[PDB]
Amino acid sequence: ILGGREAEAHARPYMASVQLNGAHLCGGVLVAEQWVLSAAHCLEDAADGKVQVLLGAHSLSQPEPSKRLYDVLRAVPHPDSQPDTIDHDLLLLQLSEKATLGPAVRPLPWQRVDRDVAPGTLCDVAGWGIVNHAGRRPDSLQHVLLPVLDRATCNRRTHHDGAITERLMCAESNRRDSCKGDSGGPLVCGGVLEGVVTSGSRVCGNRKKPGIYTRVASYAAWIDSVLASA
Numbered sequence: 001i002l003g004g005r006e007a008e009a010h011a012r013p014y015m016a017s018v019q020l021n022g023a024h025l026c027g028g029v030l031v032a033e034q035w036v037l038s039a040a041h042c043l044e045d046a047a048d049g050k051v052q053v054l055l056g057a058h059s060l061s062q063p064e065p066s067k068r069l070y071d072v073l074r075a076v077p078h079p080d081s082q083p084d085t086i087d088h089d090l091l092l093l094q095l096s097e098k099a100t101l102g103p104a105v106r107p108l109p110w111q112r113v114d115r116d117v118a119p120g121t122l123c124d125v126a127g128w129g130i131v132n133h134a135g136r137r138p139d140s141l142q143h144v145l146l147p148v149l150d151r152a153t154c155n156r157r158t159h160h161d162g163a164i165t166e167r168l169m170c171a172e173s174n175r176r177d178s179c180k181g182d183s184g185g186p187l188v189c190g191g192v193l194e195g196v197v198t199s200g201s202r203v204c205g206n207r208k209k210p211g212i213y214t215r216v217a218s219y220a221a222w223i224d225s226v227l228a229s230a
């Protein structure tokens with residue numbers, strides 16, 4: 001997260017750290033007791049290593065009573081996802097067991113009504129992604145409120161030139177933005193999950209290259225089907 005600030009500890013109980021061999025790789029969102037939603041590209045160059053999900057965390061390195069690292073029993077990338085493509089970049093991770101719920105661990109309700117979030121709406125993005133262009137990795141969870149950018153503006157030749165489908169949404173990227181290590185994490189509007197961070201053009205903090213977020217509402221049928229297949 002560039003241009004953000006340290007989040008209040010455990011104020012986002014749905015926030016997950018998807019990890020590879022003990023290291024934070026991507027953000028994730030707890031959407032059900034045993035399921036974490038993330039981005040499919042996160043596990044592309046991982047196939048070998050131990051994939052785990054850290055729940056109830058503020059600090060990545062420090063002990064906290066609510067912190068718990070879970071093993072993943074199965075990884076469900078969206079069937080239409082392709083590598084190094086920004087479309088259908090969703091991943092569902094089944095935990096080893098149902099997560100112990102409490103004030104610091106709680107699933108987030110997600111948008112099921114397939115209608116765009118109004119442009120200008122301030123939405124909260126959180127993550128353990130890089131906090132400056134030099135690549136400084138924060139130990140503690142960061143967040144930033146970003147305004148939603150209309151698809152038309154986002155799709156201009158000067159911006160993402162037609163790449164923003166109806167299944168994607170954009171947020172302003174001027175200084176404040178999501179960056180490397182934030183994909184798979186949440187974009188929350190009025191307490192509801194609206195988007196999942198994707199890597200876009202892999203450029204951060206540049207107003208001409210807005211942040212790209214996968215609209216969860218567009219994938220309601222797939223998420224429901226995966227969550228129902230215990």
Ligand SMILES: N[C@H](CO)c1cccc(-c2cccc(COc3ccccc3CC(=O)O)c2)c1
Binds near residue numbers: 042179201205211
């Ligand atoms: N705001 C912009 C566009 O929305 C944005 C948001 C989020 C990430 C990036 C971004 C910037 C540089 C390099 C990478 C490659 O990262 C990975 C590559 C492989 C696995 C995991 C990651 C981690 C990750 O994807 O976060 C991503 C850019």
